[PDB]
Amino acid sequence: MHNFIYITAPSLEEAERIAKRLLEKKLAACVNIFPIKSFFWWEGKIEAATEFAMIVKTRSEKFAEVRDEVKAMHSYTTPCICAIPIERGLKEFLDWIDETVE
């Protein structure tokens, strides 16, 4: 019913832009952002880049909208957008998420 949507962005500016858009459209309730260094295989070689990770807290049924909304404004042709399941959580906190996205 609840999940953490993990996404990476090229800069703090784009990360915050994506976060504010999801919140304004009520597709998520909270977003945590932090800098990371990435290494990935692309076109026959390992590439490294500084990026920003995002942890999007929302309802699982909102995954499709968050996914498509992010993809539409993201700099990457194929951005990382993965949903991680929440097994349990403080009721008060989870209820806040629901009232926010609903």
Side-chain angles (χ1 to χ4, degrees):
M1 285 200 289
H2 298 284
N3 63 17
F4 274 177
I5 302 174
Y6 188 80
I7 309 161
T8 71
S11 61
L12 176 59
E13 176 180 55
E14 177 155 329
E16 308 190 318
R17 190 175 306 186
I18 293 173
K20 289 176 181 173
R21 178 156 299 177
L22 295 177
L23 294 171
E24 295 185 303
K25 297 299 184 179
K26 313 295 282 178
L27 294 181
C30 178
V31 182
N32 297 160
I33 303 174
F34 58 102
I36 58 169
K37 184 169 185 177
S38 301
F39 291 79
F40 52 90
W41 189 276
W42 182 251
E43 300 193 313
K45 65 201 174 308
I46 291 166
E47 308 196 320
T50 291
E51 291 186 284
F52 287 75
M54 310 176 295
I55 294 172
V56 180
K57 320 181 195 306
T58 187
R59 284 176 64 77
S60 301
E61 62 173 345
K62 292 292 180 176
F63 178 72
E65 285 70 22
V66 170
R67 176 198 67 205
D68 299 328
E69 190 69 27
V70 169
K71 183 148 194 173
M73 63 187 290
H74 213 292
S75 289
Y76 309 169
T77 300
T78 315
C80 167
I81 304 176
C82 300
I84 302 173
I86 290 176
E87 191 170 9
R88 294 174 56 57
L90 176 66
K91 173 186 176 179
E92 292 57 42
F93 182 71
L94 295 186
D95 290 329
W96 167 69
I97 288 180
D98 298 332
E99 308 176 308
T100 304
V101 294
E102 302 173 60

